[PDB]
């Protein structure tokens, strides 16, 4: 990454943390924030390093390459560029993705005045592709998350919003009630409209 | 976090510590202090990062969002130049940038948007702890062969979960007879150490 | 904590220290050697830090209530001896319940320093010693050598003695088994411990 | 390594990380990036240290030595050396490979004005040889990766691109090797289907 | 401990150092190789730090009392050999950290010229630890003999491990040959005076 | 050790534990020797002795190492006989020199690298020990009838590495199905070629 504005080597802890997150959690949605936090201050070279250290899930990694190329093409459309000697150049899509730019070029853009934040732009493209992958690898739809006959209400709400988080990559208490089991459904409808989640779960912890 | 005043990337150790305390302890009450310690100096962005790295307990996290919106609404209710004042959603990091948060937290006078957001978050977490307390204090009663120490442990762990923001009278009433008589005979004003020694 | 431009600043408590403390409590309960570890882990701690460390303990809530009791006793005695734009800290200020972090830093870094962190740590360790003594599973009088290596018996004797006092070798000889008791009596009164264990191995 | 420019001792964490990734992953392709990251800023001495701490896989390390000598010979051809009281010398292949150069000489080149990145050049040679080894230890060819009659399309694409990565140390071959249930669907999708689209089709 | 940064400052002892010491005592007890680790873990230690490390040991309380005995003996001899706003002169119990404050220890350790109370206390502690190492040696060098099928190298390992424990206090080859089994003993005897250890081990391999 | 921020620094718990672990887990396999050198980066002689002394086992090896050290110290005294003084063998080995003296030598201008010299002696002795504890001779590494060529080459060069503390013996000791292929390859064949052919 880069820090203070000086480039810093990616740490063995950060590298291992990421590889382990991917090994342990695959593309569950909570992997996306960790990546963003682990890639705090990352140059594009560092981001490519992090992606490449993942050994498995190579289908997902190919899809990710596709999404990155879609964003790079849209970048070339939105901010077309032409260089003068002794002066730096403006980055195009393949430059933000680190395939045609050097480390020094990335550092120059990221620490220039005004700064051109190629690391954040690349990270946004990467998270866009990751969100697509998380949504795709979601095992079941939100319409199919229904409370079982003896399933504790808390566990059902856990499943409901975990699925919603994967599928949103809103505040559907109506589907939540509709998909609750009959006893809980009767109680929740009698609770009234505008009931918060705490109220719904307290009403149904029996 | 903002440290000594420059911004620092959230550390892998902190991230892992938080994820692990949630994985290993769920919402036992001692998880809230750890969050506060792990989020020392956190910007709102950092706090959102820590919350989002939690993979389970999404019911609790929705409840937490609800509480946060209640606190943000009260902030806007009570606290309504080219080159701005923070609203509720700004302190919660949903409508503010990192740079804006740094500006508020690092200023004279400082505007502690990180501490304000953390306070709202801890209010909601305490609520969640209260919800996940399996038994009320009225049901914490000493067993017939249960050591007094173990009963007091359970009693105050439950009391702590139910009071997430003379406790030795209910304690005596709920103690088993063999120990209740001794405690009653100790008299008024006995400390906990004295009560526990008497029933050792 | 408060750590030393070469001057003292406030630092966030580290995940390693927090985890070390939580782990030591999980693994060792209130064995006496938990108190040294705490003192080292709370090196330079503000009262806020000390309360943070205590609050991360999840179990043993009886002991922690007992600890609060001891803290209130020490805070009352502080108020008795030191009655009272920076202000002098009272008992509840040293215990971190009515003082802010900035107030604690100000007291701790004044010239001359008012060591509210060390004083609070002293109260906390006083209460912890009470808990260690109370939770000692055996009295020293019941530690007697079996028909058991002298070294193991002395280990038990002084581990129990350490818990119970939170110290005489006469009891050590009295409670030893006769095989070693004859040797110890013949050794001469005034024998060191090395001489006793070296003698009857 | 050289760090923001000073010399730093190689860290125990980096040494252990490298030894562990080699023990756990052998020469799977994702070992080469890790090496590059663990050797960020490494001098040639540091690179040799990391390589030498590997205890097994001595066939691969001898092959790597062969590749290093091949690159050193090409360096000497295209960047000849001529034979400076107090002044500094031009690096040959074996100096960049750390076999005839001292630590201070490596520091001098890497920290010169203009800098001569002998560490990056040596690292490039090392990664060329490692890629050759990864290719050698690849267990299957891309021609032999075919979808099973009950294999989820996602798992087959995983195997396909993992093998492709080891070999290149595509959608047409991907469809051709798919099972008929999936092949018919993919063919009906029409040309130009993206991977996301294809995988959704055969989900 | 005390460590340079441009001025010698006190730094809090780290959780890593504390854990390393407690774990090595738990895992290795008082085998001779624990004493170097302590010295390394107590690099730059003040007497307070050394006492902290010692006090974190939960077991082996017999050994810790024995250690206390040695420390008091050294402190009394210190008071003999160096009879005792400005800095006071340190006595035995000051170097042992029982009657001196942390600030006093820093003053002595950082005075010009320095009075190294931390190194002196560490020396007393290692002397006592060496006594404990000798006591907890399970067997004497006279009782280490190779069995009829024990590889010579393993036997020499046992022999010198015992020698290291027993000689932890302030000619190795002859007993080594004498206690070897006849099979290797004959070879070594035929080798000649002045055989190196490598030569002996090769001869019996 | 002695590093630049040029002061003495306390040895870190990571280095101590790393060394003890690599010795416990790998004994004197050759790849321990680089690890030691890397773990002792910037070490004073005192530090090197610390690392050696923390090893609890292998006391035969440690005496053998001591033997090699005394031979090197004697050769130093013969080559380089003797305010600031010149270091002798026992000074470089840390038995008669203080820490402050070692720092003076290591940080003088010009530097007297007592740490590098002592490390050289220690690694020389370690190489002898590594060679001795190699279980089999290179002449005895022969390809099995059903043994994959890659595994045989792995063993061959691991043994060669333990014995050096290339083409003809490798082919000669291969099994005949692979030996015939290798012989037909001709001279000058690289290892990569030999291994792809026999896969
Ligand atoms: C004022 O409140 C706020 C405060 C901060 C944030 N900020 C900026 C975040 O970054 C939050 C951090 C956060 C995380 C947990 C609890 C509280 C807060 N991040 C998410 O909340 C991610 N997240 C979003 C997808 N899903 S969902 O199931 O699709 C979903 C379900 C219901 C609804 N109504 C919408 C989405 C849930 C989830 O945990 C957001 C809101
Ligand atoms: C003077 O003594 C003090 C010193 C410091 C504090 N400070 C600031 C804290 O931060 C304390 C830390 C603490 C922890 C253990 C021992 C001592 C101290 N911690 C809480 O104050 C929160 N806390 C308070 C009770 N609860 S309870 O069981 O609900 C409960 C039980 C009985 C009653 N009557 C009411 C509530 C558990 C808990 O986590 C507080 C008191
Ligand atoms: C001898 O010179 C000195 C030097 C330093 C100290 N200082 C300041 C300490 O901090 C010592 C450090 C220490 C620790 C272990 C071994 C040696 C030394 N440690 C304690 O003082 C705590 N401590 C006290 C309770 N018990 S005990 O079993 O009840 C016990 C039973 C009988 C007797 N006579 C004493 C104690 C043992 C213990 O480890 C003290 C004395
Ligand atoms: C899309 O935007 C970019 C951004 C950055 C990169 N950069 C510079 C890399 O470095 C990529 C990082 C990377 C990783 C995942 C997603 C996106 C990016 N990292 C590699 O390792 C490339 N890479 C991946 C294996 N393959 S392949 O499987 O043989 C292979 C597969 C398909 C085809 N058509 C050909 C070969 C070899 C290879 O060169 C590349 C693309
Ligand atoms: C020039 O050579 C030297 C170089 C350096 C040292 N220095 C200062 C040390 O620190 C050495 C370090 C060391 C450790 C292991 C291998 C090599 C080196 N370590 C000890 O000197 C302590 N040490 C001493 C003997 N014992 S022994 O087995 O009792 C023993 C065995 C045989 C005989 N004849 C006597 C005693 C084991 C031990 O750990 C010493 C001598
Ligand atoms: C090729 O260009 C170079 C580049 C760098 C180096 N430098 C300075 C080293 O430090 C090398 C680093 C190194 C290590 C592995 C692969 C590549 C590189 N390290 C060793 O050379 C140690 N080493 C020692 C001999 N043995 S061997 O198996 O006994 C053996 C080897 C060769 C023959 N002909 C016979 C036996 C294995 C080994 O890895 C040397 C050469």
Q: Is D132 on the interface with F (CB under 8 A)?
A: yes
- Chain A residues in contact with B63 by the CB 8 A cut-off are 196-198, 201
Q: Which residues on adjacent β-strands are paired with residue D7?
A: D2
E2-136: CATH architecture: Orthogonal Bundle (1.10)
Check CB contact of E3 with chain C, cutoff 8 Å: no
How many whole angstroms separate alpha carbon B44 and alpha carbon B50? 10
Pocket test for ligand 6, best of D27, D39, D44, D51 (most atoms within 8 A of CB): D51
Question: Rounded to the nearest 5°, which phi and psi values hold at E115?
Answer: -110, 100
CB within 8 A of C21, min separation 6: which ones?
C37, C38, C41, C53, C56, C57
Taking CA atoms, C81 is separated from A27, C75, C78, C103, C117, in Å, by 62, 10, 5, 21, 18
In terms of CATH architecture, what is B137-199?
Answer: Orthogonal Bundle (1.10)
Copy the structure tokens of residue D67: 């590749």
Here the tokens at position C79 are 């108020």
Q: Which residue has the tokens 């010491």?
A: E21
Alpha helices by DSSP H, listed for E82-147, are 92-95, 102-109, 117-135
Dihedral (CA of C12, C16, C22, C25) sign = negative
Give the CA radius of gyration of chain B.
Answer: 22
Pairing, β E9-10 against β E2-3: antiparallel
- Measured between CA atoms, the residue of chain B closest to residue A10 is B12
Task: State which H helix or E strand residue B33 sits in.
Answer: helix B31-38
Chain F: give the shortest CA distance to residue D198, in Å.
36
> Which tokens go with F189?
């064949």
DSSP 8-state class, residue B175: S
Question: How was this entry determined?
Answer: X-ray
User: Which distant-in-sequence residues (6+ apart) come within 8 Å of B121 by Cβ?
Assistant: B35, B47, B51, B64, B68
Element holding F2 (H helix, E strand) = strand F2-3
Residues of chain D neighbouring F29 (CB-CB closer than 8 A): 55
Q: CA-to-CA distance for E30 and E132, rounded, in angstroms?
A: 7
Q: What is the DSSP string of F129-155?
A: HHHHT--S-GGG----TT--HHHHHHH
Handedness of CA C56, C60, C62, C67 (dihedral sign): negative
What are the φ/ψ torsions at residue C76 (nearest 5 degrees)? -70, -40
Q: How many angstroms separate the CA atoms of A91 and C69, rounded?
A: 65
Report chain F residues whose CB lies below 8 A from the CB of D59.
150, 153-154, 157, 191, 195
Cβ atoms of D85 and D78 closer than 8 Å: no
Residue C18's closest chain E neighbor by CA?
Answer: E15
Comparing CA positions, the residue from C110, C93, C78, C84 lying closest to residue C2 is C110
Among A97, A164, A177, CA closest to A135: A164
- C-alpha distances out from residue A70 to A66, D158, D171, D189, D200, Å: 6, 21, 18, 20, 18
Q: Is A53 on the interface with D (CB under 8 A)?
A: yes
C-alpha of residue E197 to centroid of ligand 4, in Å: 57
- Using DSSP's 3-state secondary structure scheme, residue B134 falls into coil
d(CA F106, CA F87): 11
Residue F32, Cβ neighbours under 10 Å: how many? Answer: 21
β-pairing, B2-3 with A6-7?
unpaired
Half-sphere exposure of F188 (CA within 13 A, CB side): 0
Residues E61, C155: C-beta atoms closer than 8 Å = yes
Closest-CA residue to C10 (of C114, C110, C102): C102
* DSSP-assigned letters across all residues of E190-204: HH-TT--HHHHHHHT
Using CA atoms of A113, A115, A116, A121 in order, give the dihedral in degrees to the nearest 10. 180
Q: How far is CA C137 from CA B66, C67, C134, C143, C163, in A?
A: 48, 19, 8, 11, 9
Residue F12 DSSP one-character state: P
Angle in degrees, 0-180, between the axes of helices F114-132 and F45-53, rounded to the nearest 10: 30
Q: How far apart are CA A120 and CA E30, in angstroms?
A: 55
Q: CB of B188 within 8 Å of any CB in chain A?
A: no
**Ligand 2, from C25, C35, C55: best to mutate by most atoms within 8 Å of Cβ?**
C55
Q: Which residues of E touch F10 (CB under 8 A)?
A: 1, 3, 40, 43-44
Q: Is E97 helix (H, G, I), strand (E, B) or coil?
A: coil
Given the candidates 1.10.375.10, 1.40.20.10, 1.10.630.10, 1.10.260.30, the CATH classification of the domain at C2-135 is 1.10.375.10
Q: Closest Cα partner for B142 from B131, B132, B153, B133?
A: B153
Q: Is E7's CB within 8 Å of C6's CB?
A: yes
Which atom of ligand 5 is nearest the CA belonging to E164?
29
A54 touches chain D (CB under 8 A): yes
What φ, ψ does residue C3 adopt, rounded to 5°?
Answer: -130, 145
B102 Cβ contact partners less than 8 Å away, ≥ 6 residues apart: B2, B7, B43
Q: What is the DSSP string of chain A?
A: -EE--EE-PPPHHHHHHHHHHHHHHTT-TTHHHHHHHHTTT--HHHHHHHHHT--S-HHHHHHHHHHHHHHHHHHHHHS-----TTS-----HHHHTTSS--HHHHHHHHHSSS---HHHHHHHHHHHHHHHHHHHT--S-GGG----TT--HHHHHHHHHHHHHHHT----HHHHHHHS-HHHHHHHHHH-TT--HHHHHHHT--
Task: Give the closest of B3, B16, B30 to C56, CB-based.
Answer: B30
What's the fold here for domain C140-199? Answer: 1.10.1200
Q: Are D167 and D69 in contact (CB under 8 A)?
A: no
Run of H or E residues at E2:
strand E2-3
CB E43 within 8 A of CB E17: no
Helices (H), B79-191: 88-91, 98-105, 113-131, 148-162, 170-174, 177-186
Q: Locate the ligand 6 atom nearest the alpha carbon of residue F162 and give its number.
A: 29
8 Å CB contact between B14 and A13 = no
Q: How many CB atoms lie within 10 A of CB E28?
A: 14
Burial class (CB in 10 A: 0-12, 13-18, 19+), D109: buried
Q: State whether residue F193 is helix, strand or coil.
A: helix
- The total of other beta-carbon atoms located within 10 Å of residue F42's CB is 18
> Could you tell me the distance, in angstroms and rounded to a whole number, from the CA of residue A65 to the centre of ligand 4?
7
Per-residue DSSP letters for E65-87?
HHHHHHHHHHHHHHHHHS---PP
Q: How many CB atoms lie within 10 A of CB B45?
A: 22
Q: Are C145 and C175 in contact (CB under 8 A)?
A: yes
CATH (residue range A142-203): 1.10.1200.30
> Nearest chain F Cα to D10, which residue?
F38
Q: How far is E127 from chain F (nearest CA, A)?
A: 16
- The DSSP output letter for B41 is T
The answer to whether C71 touches C123, Cβ cutoff 8 Å, is yes
**Contact predicate E40/F54, CB 8 Å:** yes
- Mutation target for E interface from F44, F54, F60, F135: give the one with most E CBs within 10 A: F60
Sole residue written with tokens 């109220």: A199
A103 in contact with B, Cβ within 8 Å: no
Secondary-structure class of domain D142-202 per CATH: mainly alpha
Q: Do domains A2-137 and A142-203 have the same CATH topology?
A: no
Q: Which of B46, B53, B66, B102 to mutate: most A Cβ within 10 Å?
A: B53
Query: Between C1, C33, C193, which is nearest E65 by CB?
Result: C193
The helix or strand, by DSSP H or E, that contains position C126, with its residue range, turns out to be: helix C116-134
Binding pocket residue ranges, ligand 5, CB within 6 Å: E 160, 163-164, 167, 172; F 49, 52-53, 59, 62-63, 65-66, 69-70, 73, 93-95
Distance between CA atoms of residues A45 and A92, nearest Å = 15
- Note whether E13 and C43 are within 8 A (CB): yes
Ligand 3, pocket-test mutation among C158, C159, C164, C170, most atoms within 8 A of CB: C158
Q: Which residues of D110-136 are buried (b: 16+ CB within 10 A; e: fewer)?
A: beeeeebebbebbbebbbebbbbbbbb
CB atoms B59 and A161 under 8 Å = yes
Q: Cis peptide leading into E147, omega within 30 of 0?
A: no
| β pairing state of C9-10 and C2-3 | antiparallel
D9 shares contact with chain A (CB less than 8 Å) = no
Fold held by B2-132: Human Immunodeficiency Virus Type 1 Capsid Protein (1.10.375)
Write down the residue that tokens 């440290």 correspond to.
B3
Residue of D nearest to A57 (CA): D158
Q: How far is CA D115 from CA D36, D101, D108, D112, in A?
A: 20, 17, 9, 4
Q: Which of E70, E121, E128, E123 is nearest to E98 (CA)?
A: E121
Taking the CA atoms of A85, A86, A92 and A95 in sequence, report the sign of the dihedral they define: positive
Q: Two tokens at D93?
A: 């292949």
- Please name which ligand lies nearest the alpha carbon of E121: 3
Half-sphere exposure at residue A19, Cβ-oriented, CA atoms within 13 angstroms: 19
Distance, in Å, from the CA atom of D47 to the CA atom of A190, rounded to the nearest integer, reads 71
Q: Which long-range contacts (CB under 8 A, 24 or more apart) does D110-118 make?
A: D110/D2, D110/D5, D110/D43, D111/D2, D111/D5, D112/D88, D116/D91, D118/D43, D118/D44, D118/D91
Closest CA to E27 of F28, F54, F35, C41: F54
Q: Which of residues 13-32 of C touch E (CB under 8 A)?
A: 14, 16-17, 20, 28, 31-32
**Alpha-carbon distance E19 to nearest alpha carbon in chain C (angstroms):** 8
CA distance linking residue A160 with residue A168, whole number of Å: 12
Q: Chain C, 135-174: which have a CB under 8 Å from a chain B CB? A: 135
- Report which of C38, C2, C45, C8 is spatially closest to residue C23, judged by C-alpha positions: C38
Q: Cβ–Cβ of C64/B40 closer than 8 Å?
A: no
Confirm if F121 and F73 have CB atoms less than 8 A apart: yes
Structure tokens at D143: 């021609």
Ligand 6 contact via D48 beta carbon (within 6 Å): yes
Nearest ligand to residue A29 Cα: 1
Please give all residues whose beta carbon lies within 6 A of any atom in ligand 3, as ranges.
C 158, 161-162, 165, 167; E 51, 54-55, 61, 64-65, 67-68, 71-72, 96-98
Instruction: Tell me the three state secondary structure of residue D3.
Output: strand
Distances (CA, A) of F155 to C3, D54, D55, F151: 54, 14, 11, 6
- Contact status, residue B141 vs residue B41, Cβ threshold 8 Å: no
Token representation of residue E85: 């706003």
Residue F107 touches chain E, beta carbons under 8 Å? no
Task: Supply φ then ψ for residue E150, to 5 degrees.
Answer: -85, 125
Cα of F118 from ligand 5 centre, angstroms: 14
Is C116 near ligand 2, meaning CB less than 6 Å away? no
Q: Which residues contact F115 (CB under 8 A, 6 or more apart)?
A: F2, F42, F43, F44, F45, F47, F48, F102, F106
Domain regions of chain F by residue span: 2-133, 138-198
Tell me whether the omega of the peptide bond preceding residue F110 falls within 30 degrees of 0, making it cis: yes
Q: What is the CATH number of domain F2-133?
A: 1.10.375.10
Q: Is F11 helix (H, G, I), strand (E, B) or coil?
A: coil
Q: In angstroms, rounded to a whole number, what is the distance separating the alpha carbons of residues E18 and C41?
A: 9
d(CA E29, nearest CA chain F) in Å? 12
- Rounded to a whole number, what is the distance in Å from the CA of A86 to chain B's nearest CA? 31
CATH of domain F138-198: 1.10.1200.30
Nearest C-alpha of chain B: how many angstroms from A61? Answer: 21
Q: Enumerate residues 6+ apart whose C-beta is below 8 A from B24.
A: none
Cβ contact, residue pair C69, B3, below 8 Å: no
Distance of alpha carbon B64 from the chain centroid? 12
User: Rounded distance, CA B35 to CA B46, Å?
Assistant: 12
CATH assignment of D2-137?
1.10.375.10
CATH classification for the domain delimited by E141-204, as one of 1.10.1200.30, 1.10.10.10, 3.30.750.24, 3.90.700.10: 1.10.1200.30
Cα dihedral C14, C19, C22, C23 in deg (nearest 10): -150
Atom of ligand 4 at shortest distance to CA of A65?
A: 1
Q: State the Cα angle at A63 between A59 and A64, rounded to 5°.
A: 115
Please return the burial class of F186, using the count of CB atoms within 10 Å of its CB with bins 0-12, 13-18 and 19+. Answer: exposed
Instruction: For residue F4, give the nearest of D2, D106, E13 by alpha carbon.
Output: D2
The full DSSP string for B95-111 is: S--HHHHHHHHSSSS--
C40 with E56: Cβ contact below 8 A: yes
């Amino acid at each position: 990454p880069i820090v203070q504005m000086v480039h810093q080597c990616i740490s063995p802890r950060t590298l291992n943390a990421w590889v382990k997150v991917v090994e342990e959690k695959a593309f569950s949605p909570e992997v996306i924030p960790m990546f963003s936090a682990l890639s705090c201050g990352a140059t594009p070279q560092d981001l490519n390093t992090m992606l490449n250290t993942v050994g498995g899930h190579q289908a997902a990694m190919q899809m990710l390459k596709e999404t990155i190329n879609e964003e790079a093409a849209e970048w070339d459309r939105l901010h077309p560029v032409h260089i003068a000697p002794g002066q730096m150049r403006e980055p195009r899509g393949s430059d933000i993705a680190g395939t045609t730019s050097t480390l020094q070029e990335q550092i120059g853009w990221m620490t220039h005045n005004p700064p051109i934040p190629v690391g954040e732009i690349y990270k946004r493209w990467i998270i866009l592709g990751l969100n697509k992958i998380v949504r795709m690898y979601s095992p079941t739809s939100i319409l199919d998350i229904r409370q079982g006959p003896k399933e504790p209400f808390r566990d059902y709400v856990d499943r409901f919003y975990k699925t919603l988080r994967a599928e949103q990559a809103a505040a559907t208490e109506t589907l939540l009630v509709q998909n609750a089991n009959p006893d809980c459904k009767t109680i929740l409808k009698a609770l009234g409209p505008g009931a918060t989640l705490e109220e719904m779960m307290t009403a149904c912890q029996g």
